Amino acid sequence: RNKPGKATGKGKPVNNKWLNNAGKDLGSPVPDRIANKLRDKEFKSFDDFRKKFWEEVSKDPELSKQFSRNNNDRMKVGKAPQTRTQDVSGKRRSFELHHEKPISQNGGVYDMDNISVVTPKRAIDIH
Amino acid sequence: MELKNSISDYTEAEFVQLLKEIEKENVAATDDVLYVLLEHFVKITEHPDGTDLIYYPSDNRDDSPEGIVKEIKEWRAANGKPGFKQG
């Protein structure tokens, strides 16, 4: 979809309720332990990045424990976890990765500091 | 598989087979088929929290097919709704 590139950024430390703020404000940030696993690595596109992102989440003991078994299975194959029913919006019922500063202006495609996790509902709201 | 129209058409064992079918599509490349199965799960269980029973189970119960079936049984019974097929 997009163009190849390498991941950069540091992200932020998170508690045991990582996505509790998903959507609200700018959503949840990229965990620092996850950034350390993706940093400097190259990707064919943002979609390939997204798949690698969720896979790393499934391998991080302190993060996967925050998800149900069915959601961990989704992340293990590169898919985003399903959100609670109340946070769904049409065909979009899983967490989405949002760019703070849109690719349009400036950019920041693989910059994990310009990437966050938000719910479908707020993903639309913010826009 | 065969998707029945009502929960009353499903034995408990049969409902578990639907859950594993959903678990299979959960790991599929796309969600196209999964969403169709999830819609059916929501329609027949009639539970207000819908897919949350699958992806956001309560801590007071096991996060497993058996735990799902158990919660559904208790909710429907408490609300006077018809339960799983005794067959």
- Fill in the DSSP letter of residue A106: S
For this entry, resolution in Å reads: 2.1
Looking at the complex, does the CB of residue A16 fall below 8 Å from at least one CB of chain B?
no
Interface test with B, best of A48, A67, A82, A86 (most B CBs within 10 A): A82
Query: Residue B47's domain spans which residues?
Result: 1-87
- Answer yes or no: do A68 and B54 touch at CB < 8 A: yes
H/E element, A58: helix A46-59
Torsions phi, psi of B45, nearest 5? -75, -30
Q: What is the distance between the alpha carbons of residues A84 and A56, in angstroms, rounded to a whole number? A: 22
Name residue, tokens 């989405």.
A96
CA-based torsion, B54, B73, B67, A18: positive or negative:
positive
Chain breaks of chain B after residues with C–N above 2.5 Å? none
Residue A30 near residue A116, CB atoms below 8 Å: yes
Question: Rounded to an integer, what is the distance from CA A90 to the centroid of its chain?
Answer: 19
Q: Which of A115, A106, A104, A99 is nearest to A39 (CA)?
A: A115
Contact B67, A102 (CB under 8 A): no
- Token reading at A40: 């400097």
Number of independent structural domains in chain B:
1
Instruction: Please give the Cα distance from B65 to A103 (Å, whole number).
Output: 42
Chain length of chain B:
87
CB A108 within 8 A of CB A88: no
Report the alpha-carbon distance of residue A14 to residue A57 in Å, rounded. 12
CA atoms of B61 and A94, how far apart (whole Å): 24
Contact across the interface for B26 and A85, Cβ inside 8 Å: no
> Which run of H or E residues covers position A34?
helix A32-38
Query: A80 with A87: CB under 8 angstroms?
Result: no
As a whole number of angstroms, the distance between CA A43 and CA B36 comes to 32
Q: Which CATH superfamily is domain A1-127 in?
A: Colicin/pyocin, DNase domain (3.90.540.10)
Host H or E run for residue A120 = helix A120-125
* CA distance, residue A106 to nearest chain B CA (Å): 31
Token duo for residue A108: 């920041």
Alpha carbons within 13 angstroms on the beta-carbon side of residue B83 total: 15
Distances (CA, A) of A34 to A8, A14, A100, A115: 11, 11, 18, 12
Distance CA A75, CA A72 (A): 5
Which uninterrupted H or E stretch holds A36?
helix A32-38
Task: Please provide the DSSP assignment of B50-73 as one string.
Answer: TTHHHHS--TTS-SSHHHHHHHHH
Please provide the DSSP assignment of chain B as one string: ----SSGGG-BHHHHHHHHHHHHHHHTSS-SHHHHHHHHHHHHHH--TTTTHHHHS--TTS-SSHHHHHHHHHHHHHHTT----B--
Q: How was this structure determined?
A: X-ray
Cβ(A106)–Cβ(A116) below 8 Å: no
Residue A22 corresponds to which tokens in the numbers above? 């998903």
Handedness of CA A44, A50, A53, A54 (dihedral sign): negative
Yes or no, beta carbons of B55 and A70 under 8 Å apart: yes
Q: For the domain that residue B70 is a member of, what is the CATH number?
A: 1.10.1200.20
Whether residue B12 contacts residue B69, with contact meaning beta carbons closer than 8 Å, is answered with yes
* Cα-based torsion angle of the residue sequence A41, A44, A46, A50 in order, rounded to the nearest 10 degrees: -60
Q: Is A92 on the interface with B (CB under 8 A)?
A: no
For residue A90, give the amino acid letter: G
Residue A58 phi, psi dihedral angles, 5° rounding = -65, -25
Residue labelled with tokens 């599929």: B28
Report the residue count for chain A. 127
